[PDB]
Amino acid sequence: DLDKIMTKMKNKSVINIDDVDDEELLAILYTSKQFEKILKNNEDSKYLENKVFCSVFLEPSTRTRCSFDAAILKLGSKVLNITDMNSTSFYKGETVEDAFKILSTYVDGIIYRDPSKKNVDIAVSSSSKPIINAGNGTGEHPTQSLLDFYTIHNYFPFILDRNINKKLNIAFVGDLKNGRTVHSLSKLLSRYNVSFNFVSCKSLNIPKDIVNTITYNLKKNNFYSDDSIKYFDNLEEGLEDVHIIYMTRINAFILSNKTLENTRDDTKILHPLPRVNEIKVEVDSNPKSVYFTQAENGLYVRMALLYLIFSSTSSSHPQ
Amino acid sequence: DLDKIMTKMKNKSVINIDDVDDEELLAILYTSKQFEKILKNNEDSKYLENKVFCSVFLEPSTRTRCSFDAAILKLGSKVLNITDMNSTSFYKGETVEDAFKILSTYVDGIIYRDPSKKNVDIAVSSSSKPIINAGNGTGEHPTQSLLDFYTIHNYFPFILDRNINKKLNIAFVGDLKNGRTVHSLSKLLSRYNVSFNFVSCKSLNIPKDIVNTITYNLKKNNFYSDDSIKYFDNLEEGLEDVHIIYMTRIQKERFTDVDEYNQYKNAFILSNKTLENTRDDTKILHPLPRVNEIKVEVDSNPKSVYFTQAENGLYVRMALLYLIFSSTSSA
Amino acid sequence: DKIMTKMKNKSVINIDDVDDEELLAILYTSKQFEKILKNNEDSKYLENKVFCSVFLEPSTRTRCSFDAAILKLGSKVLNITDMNSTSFYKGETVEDAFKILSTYVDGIIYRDPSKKNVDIAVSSSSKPIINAGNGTGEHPTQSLLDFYTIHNYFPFILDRNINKKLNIAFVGDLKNGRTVHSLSKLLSRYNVSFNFVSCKSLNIPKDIVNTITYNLKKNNFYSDDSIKYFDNLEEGLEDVHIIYMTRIQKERNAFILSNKTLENTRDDTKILHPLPRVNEIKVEVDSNPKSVYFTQAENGLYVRMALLYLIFSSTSHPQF
Numbered sequence: 001d002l003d004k005i006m007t008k009m010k011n012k013s014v015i016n017i018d019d020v021d022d023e024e025l026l027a028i029l030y031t032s033k034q035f036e037k038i039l040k041n042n043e044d045s046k047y048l049e050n051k052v053f054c055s056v057f058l059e060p061s062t063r064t065r066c067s068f069d070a071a072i073l074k075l076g077s078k079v080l081n082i083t084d085m086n087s088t089s090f091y092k093g094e095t096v097e098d099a100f101k102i103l104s105t106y107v108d109g110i111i112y113r114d115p116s117k118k119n120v121d122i123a124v125s126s127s128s129k130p131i132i133n134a135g136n137g138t139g140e141h142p143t144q145s146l147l148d149f150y151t152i153h154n155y156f157p158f159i160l161d162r163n164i165n166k167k168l169n170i171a172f173v174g175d176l177k178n179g180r181t182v183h184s185l186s187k188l189l190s191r192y193n194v195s196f197n198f199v200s201c202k203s204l205n206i207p208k209d210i211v212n213t214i215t216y217n218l219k220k221n222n223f224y225s226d227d228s229i230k231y232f233d234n235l236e237e238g239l240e241d242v243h244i245i246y247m248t249r250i251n252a253f254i255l256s257n258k259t260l261e262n263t264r265d266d267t268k269i270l271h272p273l274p275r276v277n278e279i280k281v282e283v284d285s286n287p288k289s290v291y292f293t294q295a296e297n298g299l300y301v302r303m304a305l306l307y308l309i310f311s312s313t314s315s316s317h318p319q
Numbered sequence: 320d321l322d323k324i325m326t327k328m329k330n331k332s333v334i335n336i337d338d339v340d341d342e343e344l345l346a347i348l349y350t351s352k353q354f355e356k357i358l359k360n361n362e363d364s365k366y367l368e369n370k371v372f373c374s375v376f377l378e379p380s381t382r383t384r385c386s387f388d389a390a391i392l393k394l395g396s397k398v399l400n401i402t403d404m405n406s407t408s409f410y411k412g413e414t415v416e417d418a419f420k421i422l423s424t425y426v427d428g429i430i431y432r433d434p435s436k437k438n439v440d441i442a443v444s445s446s447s448k449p450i451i452n453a454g455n456g457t458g459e460h461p462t463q464s465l466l467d468f469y470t471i472h473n474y475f476p477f478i479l480d481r482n483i484n485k486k487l488n489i490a491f492v493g494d495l496k497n498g499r500t501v502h503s504l505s506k507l508l509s510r511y512n513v514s515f516n517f518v519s520c521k522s523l524n525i526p527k528d529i530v531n532t533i534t535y536n537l538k539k540n541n542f543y544s545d546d547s548i549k550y551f552d553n554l555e556e557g558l559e560d561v562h563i564i565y566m567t568r569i570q571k572e573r574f575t576d577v578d579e580y581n582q583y584k585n586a587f588i589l590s591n592k593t594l595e596n597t598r599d600d601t602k603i604l605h606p607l608p609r610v611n612e613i614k615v616e617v618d619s620n621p622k623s624v625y626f627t628q629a630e631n632g633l634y635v636r637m638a639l640l641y642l643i644f645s646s647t648s649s650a
Numbered sequence: 651d652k653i654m655t656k657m658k659n660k661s662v663i664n665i666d667d668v669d670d671e672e673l674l675a676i677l678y679t680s681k682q683f684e685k686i687l688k689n690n691e692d693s694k695y696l697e698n699k700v701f702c703s704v705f706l707e708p709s710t711r712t713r714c715s716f717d718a719a720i721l722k723l724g725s726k727v728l729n730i731t732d733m734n735s736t737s738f739y740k741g742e743t744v745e746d747a748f749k750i751l752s753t754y755v756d757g758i759i760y761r762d763p764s765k766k767n768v769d770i771a772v773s774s775s776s777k778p779i780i781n782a783g784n785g786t787g788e789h790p791t792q793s794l795l796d797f798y799t800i801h802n803y804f805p806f807i808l809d810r811n812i813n814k815k816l817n818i819a820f821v822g823d824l825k826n827g828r829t830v831h832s833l834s835k836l837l838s839r840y841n842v843s844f845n846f847v848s849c850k851s852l853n854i855p856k857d858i859v860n861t862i863t864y865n866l867k868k869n870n871f872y873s874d875d876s877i878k879y880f881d882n883l884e885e886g887l888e889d890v891h892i893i894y895m896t897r898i899q900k901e902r903n904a905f906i907l908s909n910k911t912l913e914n915t916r917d918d919t920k921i922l923h924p925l926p927r928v929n930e931i932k933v934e935v936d937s938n939p940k941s942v943y944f945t946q947a948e949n950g951l952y953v954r955m956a957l958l959y960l961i962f963s964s965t966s967h968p969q970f
């Protein structure tokens with residue numbers, strides 16, 4: 001019931017993927033799809049005009065910031081930017097609480113990226129306007145989790161069915177210790193009938209805190225077993241019967257056409273990007289690779305999220 | 320008569336607060352109030368669409384620039400920004416006169432902030448388009464003066480009456496030497512029936528050039544007396560029978576070194592304790608940011624309005640853009 | 651409308667990417683925008699588009715020019731700015747960066763001192779790119795607005811009439827002035843004669859004289875009065891319809907234009923300069939009705955709007 005769920009999402013801050021429930025995730029995935037088709041058919045997309053937002057990027061994060069700016073502009077709204085700056089030069093004197101209390105009186109909402117853990121939680125306390133977390137230094141990056149999930153759902157829409165018979169399996173590969181992109185998606189995936197293969201070098205294993213959240217969430221839905229989670233130190237074994245391969249950022253695990261010879265027919269490769277050697281150019285040509293569609297889907301998910309939070313009357317729903 | 324006054328203000332450059340006369344101040348205050356209500360009642364605010372402005376900020380001044388950006392965008396216009404730059408890296412050796420002659424052919428108006436005194440005066444000579452000064456070195460910051468005045472007028476609308484019997488008293492507290500925010504507002508307030516209490520440390524007293532402008536302006540309106548201006552070095556006396564307390568910034572970079580800053584940054588800290596012996600109706604202003612001047616405890620105190628003040632900048636900057644750039648007689 | 655259909659989704663990198671018919675559409679459209687704007691008419695002929703402006707060197711005048719064009723057409727733009735090749739491309743391939751960026755937006759305005767980077771950007775981008783300047787000297791929009799200016803005062807450059815020939819003096823640093831090279835290339839397609847005025851070790855490169863010579867021959871306009879070389883203004887500024895003065899960049903004077911040095915030029919001569927100036931042209935000359943370097947800079951808005959409109963329209967033509 002889009003309209004029940006829209007009323008509930010109106011003026012919601014999105015900081016953590018756990019701020020988004022079952023019903024909300026469904027509206028986001030249904031709305032993101034409507035924006036994918038509207039844009040792909042070159043139709044009018046101005047479903048959120050008359051908003052003025054502030055984008056605050058206190059670390060270099062060009063790809064994410066351009067993603068949000070494009071979302072806002074394609075919806076027909078305007079944005080004022082703070083950019084190419086850091087915590088100390090932005091907040092010259094000033095308490096984060098004063099800066100957000102004032103900033104939030106000029107605009108309808110704020111997109112905030114800040115390496116500081118604390119600063120985003122203060123910004124939410126202090127802001128009279130909704131804030132969307134664009135990434136901080138606890139690894140909260142909800143929009144990346146949501147667009148990772150949207151990608152996977154398009155190839156395997158039975159993840160949403162919670163079907164004891166239809167289980168999805170995924171390999172996370174590379175640096176699982178620091179890959180906060182893995183942690184955030186794991187958290188979201190484990191809400192569903194999903195199995196995990198953690199492929200790493202020893203001193204970059206998945207943290208225990210994360211194994212525990214997966215284990216807790218799989219048990220809540222009666223999908224936990226001894227084949228819920230498995231750990232490999234090599235691709236050959238690790239890439240076995242997996243519907244998704246998700247490669248992390250920063251040798252041990254370079255994806256090549258050779259190393260994809262014994263994967264499922266239907267397997268799809270994700271990567272939050274940028275890459276460096278993790279995935280060889282040769283793989284871009286391989287029909288299993290979808291990391292570029294994934295990045296593209298960021299636009300449709302960020303538009304859907306802005307639409308669902310900031311729409312006023314909302315009557316003329318996306319079609 | 321907003322129609323007569325709007326025709327007169329169309330294409331006006333606003334550089335100093337003395338560019339703004341009686342009638343114009345009234346239009347600005349009346350228009351700013353209309354934008355306060357429009358925004359507070361979630362109505363359409365796109366009263367100035369199809370304009371394209373350049374915002375040129377050649378010093379870090381993020382809060383003022385965001386204020387102007389929001390004003391322009393909420394009016395339904397567009398803006399190209401120059402930002403995170405300084406005079407020499409922008410001009411790369413080109414005359415300010417050539418740069419503004421060219422820039423002003425691409426856009427409808429320019430918002431200009433530059434620490435250089437001279438640069439803004441030249442920009443106005445050379446520009447074929449109206450300029451709003453968003454702050455320069457000489458202390459001219461007309462939009463801060465206008466939003467300071469708008470705030471005060473909302474709580475004490477009899478400043479506008481020039482009634483011999485209804486007089487407003489204001490304490491400016493802190494750094495009155497370098498607080499160019501005090502000098503600009505003093506200049507505007509003294510046009511009216513106002514009395515001043517300058518509260519400072521000795522080596523941060525108000526300059527005499529400013530006392531003389533106040534004195535001259537109060538005489539012109541037959542409001543001068545020897546209780547027009549009083550000087551205190553302490554809050555107890557200084558905050559006595561005053562309708563407004565205006566607290567200034569303490570800016571470390573106006574001080575020979577760190578040691579001079581600290582010996583003055585905590586001379587006058589406003590607390591709930593130090594507001595015991597003020598009028599019931601007194602209101603606290605601060606152009607912000609604060610650092611210690613005002614204890615968080617005071618934010619909860621109904622006398623504090625420094626956050627409303629900051630908020631009012633959006634309404635005053637929208638009003639001023641609308642009055643200068645709109646092509647038509649409407650509201 | 652024939653020419654617009656053909657230009658739709660074109661990348662413009664080099665002035666040689668623009669042909670006879672395309673140059674005519676650009677000149678006709680740029681004039682439509684000049685009149686619309688000068689008469690304060692609605693100019694929103696390209697709404698609902700979203701561009702990315704990527705400027706990986708400080709180039710304020712050109713960047714603001716394109717941003718103003720995009721906004722006056724009624725479209726939106728997200729800016730990357732005050733960044734320099736290595737800090738953008740944190741360590742990422744130019745090909746990945748453009749493959750992704752081009753999925754968010756309708757078109758990209760790209761300035762980058764790297765030669766290579768712009769060519770990679772065009773290979774990788776699923777969207778049209780307009781080159782706003784690179785470090786081979788390609789700057790098509792500057793050539794287009796230089797040509798538009800000249801055409802306004804001497805519209806017989808377009809006629810290719812053996813009897814109506816235009817003569818132009820390029821003055822200053824002809825070696826490095828890649829603004830001269832780009833315009834020379836475009837002018838020589840027409841019935842034009844060239845006077846290169848310089849100090850010896852800043853003469854025009856031979857590669858450029860050869861392109862002029864080739865293009866004049868192709869149209870049967872070449873002769874031994876096609877190109878002439880002076881080391882002084884007196885001779886060099888002889889019977890020339892256009893004087894184009896160059897920048898002198900001290901990272902790499904002899905010819906100051908004054909009212910004195912313009913006394914024995916044609917009555918109809920017009921002075922261009924891509925700007926900024928320093929001493930090349932005395933402020934006294936601004937008052938002289940021959941000077942048009944400020945109209946030239948102004949015409950950048952009309953030409954950049956025309957070019958955006960001709961490429962990005964997907965759809966009542968621009969009228970007065």
Ligand SMILES: CC(C)(C)OC(=O)Nc1sc(-c2ccccc2)cc1C(=O)NCCO
Pocket residue numbers: 089090091092093379380381382383384454460463500568606607608
């Ligand atoms: C209100 C008044 C003080 C009169 O004007 C401004 O808004 N101008 C200024 S300058 C400034 C500042 C802060 C610390 C160190 C140096 C300069 C604060 C702001 C500002 O706008 N924000 C700067 C945020 O980085």
